[PDB]
Write a protein that binds this ligand. Sequence first.
Ligand SMILES: O=C1Nc2ncccc2N[C@@H]1Cc1c[nH]c2ccccc12
Ligand SMILES: [K+]
Length: 344
Amino acid sequence: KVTTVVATPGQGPDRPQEVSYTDTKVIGNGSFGVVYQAKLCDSGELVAIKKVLQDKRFKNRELQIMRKLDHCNIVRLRYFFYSSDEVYLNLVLDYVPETVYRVARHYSRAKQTLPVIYVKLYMYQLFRSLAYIHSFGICHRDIKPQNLLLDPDTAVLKLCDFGSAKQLVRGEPNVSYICSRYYRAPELIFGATDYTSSIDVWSAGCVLAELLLGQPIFPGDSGVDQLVEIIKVLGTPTREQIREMNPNYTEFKFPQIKAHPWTKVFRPRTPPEAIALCSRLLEYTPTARLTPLEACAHSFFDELRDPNVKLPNGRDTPALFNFTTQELSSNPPLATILIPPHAR
Ligand SMILES: O=C1Nc2ncccc2N[C@@H]1Cc1c[nH]c2ccccc12
Ligand SMILES: [K+]
């Protein structure tokens, strides 16, 4: 059976139009509602449909954000429409079934690690989309492998699920119990309500580490135990470090503990540039962590800037250097490193 609805295009001019889709099936569940998978009658293309109960009085954060964003490493909002005593906002997004979580798991059940080339690819695209959204003052606040969608053929990564995303404003408080526990920044565990988009960088570091290790680097049993797991690696933070985090709750029973050597945390083979990048992302002090652009310009990604580089299946790497001035907003003179002359 075919369903026709009147939907406004997410990126185009605010003009409604009739849109038709068929073959609808439930693929997702959350505290927000339901996520369906359908096929557009016109294009034949597959989409996901996130159905969210909305209150007329208040505007939807995710919708306001998805209409701003237009990036290759970010899931696209095709259209959006309302369905029936309550109203549901329906977001029509690009359907990409494969996730980084699924891929990593596939390897880790095999007890082997993902090839470094795939790791460099995925992470780089992640920092790109992050550099993009951070330029608007927008923080994703739910960076995790399950929200990184992959096209296996092109190896293109797209950030998705902006259900926790928000445009941060200085002086305005934000919720501390946010983000997936394993990827939750330390300041959040300290109850900080005045944090920056640098928490996403933390989460990104957690993703990188998990791809090198084959398992999550900080596997907390609770919101507080997560901190202990962090400590078991970074040691206990100095008072200056805790000050930078700006905690709502001052302290926990934990004793002073010396840090573990990064080298020893990872496997013996693990590349040094990878490890070196991890230590720069996973810092206690939020201001000490790299910006998404600085991370892209890291030595770890130099293999991608080689003019001879190709995919393992012989195909060419996706557009990795098509930077907009909006993306370079953070630090424009990094363009002479991010953009190799052969790519100009
Ligand atoms: O935008 C997305 N598109 C997708 N396409 C295929 C698989 C997963 C996703 N995720 C986001 C849509 C989404 C967002 N939250 C979800 C929860 C359950 C299932 C799906 C979602
Ligand atoms: K509409």
